[PDB]
């Protein structure tokens, strides 16, 4: 299902595939922040908010409507703050994409995986005519992407 609360239809969808995390910063090396004065406590929160907002604005700048996030089991791939910001910009979010069907997805809809924010450019996006979730009567929900401008052989 889509993590976004409210958006279930996108016409003329621009789709991008993400392999990094929209969360708080975390170096691969052991890191910790030391506080010894009361101003730093407010400063940490403010800088966290600015850091997340910058990434979300960069994503919005390219015209993306549908975002796919690949699964990550070491750090959170999507925090509540980032999801709230993405909802405020009318972007449909889908998370927990398996690491083994990325080739099939890229071959189908023509996406190019992006592992760095600097490389998130309008030419790494795929174009589809309709992206929407359907509800079968009682068996559950499903998600269909149909009408790809550059269709692969799948």
């Amino acid at each position: 299902k889509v993590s976004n609360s409210g958006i279930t239809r996108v016409e003329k969808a621009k789709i991008g595939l993400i392999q990094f995390c929209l969360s708080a910063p975390k170096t691969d090396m052991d890191n910790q922040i030391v506080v010894s004065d009361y101003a730093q406590m407010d400063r940490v929160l403010r800088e966290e908010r600015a850091y997340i907002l910058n990434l979300v604005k960069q994503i919005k700048k390219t015209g993306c409507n549908v975002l796919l996030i690949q699964k990550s089991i070491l750090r959170d791939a999507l925090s509540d703050l980032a999801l709230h910001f993405l909802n405020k910009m009318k972007i449909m979010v889908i998370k927990d994409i398996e690491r083994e069907d990325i080739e099939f997805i890229c071959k189908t809809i023509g996406t190019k995986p992006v592992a760095h924010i600097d490389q998130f450019t309008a030419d790494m996006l795929g174009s589809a005519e309709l992206a929407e979730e359907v509800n079968l009567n009682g068996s559950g929900k499903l998600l269909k992407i149909t009408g790809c401008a550059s269709p692969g052989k799948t």
Partner: protein, 351 residues
């Protein structure tokens, strides 16, 4: 030097303590008569932390034994290593609580806690500078839980800034010995949270499933379970009792081990000792609350507590704070948040 006194309450607590002291005494060379026949003086560098020396050479444990029924003291006195204790440290009543939290906490406990507080005063008067207390009890009984919790509160009032550690057994997942076990456990965790520095939760079924499969031969009674618990406690306290390459009292372990004050519950292990802040605790409480509500919605067995003086809203506050504890534990994983309630309705329109 930085003495610690040990308090045992209830049948289970007494059974565990009687083996804890037995397995400690053989390490330090003490005899069932109280004398000493050890060889290496390394055993005597930190002997005074647990034993008080009397005139004539005897060593007596710094222990107080408590219960509301005189059945267990007769066994303890008549059992092994049961004659080194001070005869004046046995405190008992005449009736018993009958697995009722309210009777232990309000009616029968209130007329006996004064004796315990007058014994701990005399045991503390003989130590140069005490550092804390050890408590052993159970969460599924009446004397162990309610009376033990009342005793914890009273000790915290009388001794403000001394450490306090507990070794509490917990209800088993798929089997409950007592019908009212969720009530007692939920009403005791509320006041275990805010009056202890650390708690060492021990489960009966988990350790009970070691003698059958690992020990290769048993059809036992509480017996060897108790001995294993005593061995775990000795492996915990070896740092206090003995000097080594790096000696550290329980505070010097807690400070490295407890970052956040209210999350101070542990799960032990043993490989012949391991102590871990595994968040698998959040699974245990989630079960207990699950039972509590299921009964409280039907007002089952409530009149047994209300008649003793308790009010209906005490249960509500206890369950609210149990939910708060569960949520606080859950906010540390961010992976269990993926298991939110599956959406069942069909309203997924504009916004």
């Amino acid at each position: 030097m930085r003495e610690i006194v040990h308090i045992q309450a209830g049948q289970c607590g007494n059974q565990i303590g009687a083996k804890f002291w037995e397995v400690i005494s053989d390490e330090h060379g003490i005899d069932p008569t109280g004398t000493y026949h050890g060889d290496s003086d390394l055993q005597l560098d930190r002997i005074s932390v647990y034993y008080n020396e009397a005139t004539g050479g005897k060593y007596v444990p710094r222990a107080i034994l408590v219960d509301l029924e005189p059945g267990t003291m007769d066994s303890v006195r008549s059992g092994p290593f049961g004659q080194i204790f001070r005869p004046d440290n046995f405190v008992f009543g005449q009736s018993g609580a009958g697995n009722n939290w309210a009777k232990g906490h309000y009616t029968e406990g209130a007329e006996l806690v004064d004796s315990v507080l007058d014994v701990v005063r005399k045991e503390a008067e003989s130590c140069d500078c005490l550092q804390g207390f050890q408590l052993t009890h159970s969460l599924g009984g009446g004397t162990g839980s309610g009376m033990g919790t009342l005793l914890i509160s009273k000790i915290r009032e009388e001794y403000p800034d001394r450490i306090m550690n507990t070794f509490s057994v917990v209800p088993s997942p798929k089997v409950s010995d007592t019908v009212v076990e969720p009530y007692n456990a939920t009403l005791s965790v509320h006041q275990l949270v805010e009056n202890t520095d650390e708690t060492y939760c021990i489960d009966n079924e988990a350790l009970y499933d070691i003698c059958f499969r690992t020990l290769k031969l048993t059809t036992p009674t509480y017996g060897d379970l108790n001995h294993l618990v005593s061995a775990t406690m000795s492996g915990v306290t070896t740092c206090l009792r003995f000097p080594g390459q790096l000696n550290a009292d329980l505070r010097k372990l807690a400070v490295n081990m407890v970052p956040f004050p209210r999350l101070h519950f542990f799960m032990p292990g043993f490989a012949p000792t391991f102590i871990g802040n595994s968040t698998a605790i959040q699974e245990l409480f989630k079960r207990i609350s699950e039972q509590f509500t299921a009964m409280f919605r039907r007002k089952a067995f409530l009149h047994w507590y209300t008649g003793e003086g308790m009010d209906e809203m005490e249960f509500t506050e206890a369950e609210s704070n149990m939910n708060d504890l569960v949520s606080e534990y859950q906010q540390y994983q961010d992976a269990t948040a993926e298991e939110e309630e599956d959406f069942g309705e069909e309203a997924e329109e504009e916004a």
